[PDB]
C-alpha cells in the first residue's frame, strides 16, 4: 500500500533552454519499454517527434525497444538523455543495441551513454542495416529518466 506522491502542484520551471529536438525517425512496426513514463510523456511521443520521454527510474534489464517491419538502413543513432531542467536524469550504466536484419540473430551494442548522458555515434556498416534498435539498462538508477532527443538518421 505504497503512498502516490503527487507532483502535478505546476512549479515555474529553472531552465529556459529548449527541453526537446524533435526529428521525423523511420516509421517503426512497434515501440516496446518496460519503464512506467510520467506526465503522459511516453517513448511513442518521443520518438514521433512530438516532446521528450520521462520514464520513472530505470532498473536492470530494462528496454526501450524500436522494431521495423522491413530492413532499415542506419547512418547515425543518437539517444540524448537528461535535459537542462532534469540533467540528473540521464541513461547511467545503458547501452544502445541493434538488431541486424542478417548476421548475427541476438542483440549487439553499439554505443553506450557517456559522461554527457548522450549516446551518439555513426553506425558501422555491419550494423546498418537493422530489424531493431533497442536501449538496455545494465543497473539500477538512483534517477528518473528523461529522453531529449531520439534520432536515427538514414543514409538518404
Ligand atoms: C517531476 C519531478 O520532479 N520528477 C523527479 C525526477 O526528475 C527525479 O529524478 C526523481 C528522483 O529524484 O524524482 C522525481 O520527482
Redesign the pocket.
Same mark, same amino acid.
Given at each position: 500500500h505504497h503512498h502516490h #506522491?503527487h507532483?502535478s502542484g505546476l512549479v515555474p520551471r529553472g531552465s529556459h533552454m529548449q527541453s526537446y529536438f524533435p526529428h521525423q525517425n523511420p516509421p517503426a512496426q512497434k515501440i516496446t519499454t518496460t519503464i512506467e513514463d @510520467?506526465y503522459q510523456h511516453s517513448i511513442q511521443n518521443a520518438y514521433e517527434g512530438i516532446d521528450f520521454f520521462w520514464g520513472k527510474?530505470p532498473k536492470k534489464g530494462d528496454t526501450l525497444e524500436f522494431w521495423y517491419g522491413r530492413p532499415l538502413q542506419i547512418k547515425r543513432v543518437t539517444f540524448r538523455s537528461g535535459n537542462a531542467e #532534469?540533467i540528473?536524469?540521464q541513461f547511467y550504466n545503458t547501452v544502445v543495441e541493434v538488431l541486424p536484419a542478417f548476421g548475427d540473430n541476438n542483440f549487439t551494442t553499439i554505443l553506450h551513454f557517456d559522461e554527457f548522458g548522450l549516446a551518439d555515434g555513426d553506425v558501422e556498416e555491419e550494423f546498418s542495416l537493422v530489424k531493431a534498435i533497442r536501449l538496455r539498462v545494465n543497473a539500477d538508477s538512483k @534517477?528518473?529518466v528523461i529522453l531529449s532527443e531520439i534520432y536515427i538518421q538514414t543514409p538518404d
Amino acid at each position: 500500500h505504497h503512498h502516490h #506522491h503527487h507532483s502535478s502542484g505546476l512549479v515555474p520551471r529553472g531552465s529556459h533552454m529548449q527541453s526537446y529536438f524533435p526529428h521525423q525517425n523511420p516509421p517503426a512496426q512497434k515501440i516496446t519499454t518496460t519503464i512506467e513514463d @510520467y506526465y503522459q510523456h511516453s517513448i511513442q511521443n518521443a520518438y514521433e517527434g512530438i516532446d521528450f520521454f520521462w520514464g520513472k527510474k530505470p532498473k536492470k534489464g530494462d528496454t526501450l525497444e524500436f522494431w521495423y517491419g522491413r530492413p532499415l538502413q542506419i547512418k547515425r543513432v543518437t539517444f540524448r538523455s537528461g535535459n537542462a531542467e #532534469h540533467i540528473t536524469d540521464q541513461f547511467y550504466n545503458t547501452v544502445v543495441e541493434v538488431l541486424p536484419a542478417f548476421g548475427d540473430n541476438n542483440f549487439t551494442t553499439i554505443l553506450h551513454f557517456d559522461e554527457f548522458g548522450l549516446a551518439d555515434g555513426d553506425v558501422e556498416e555491419e550494423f546498418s542495416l537493422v530489424k531493431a534498435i533497442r536501449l538496455r539498462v545494465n543497473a539500477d538508477s538512483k @534517477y528518473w529518466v528523461i529522453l531529449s532527443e531520439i534520432y536515427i538518421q538514414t543514409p538518404d
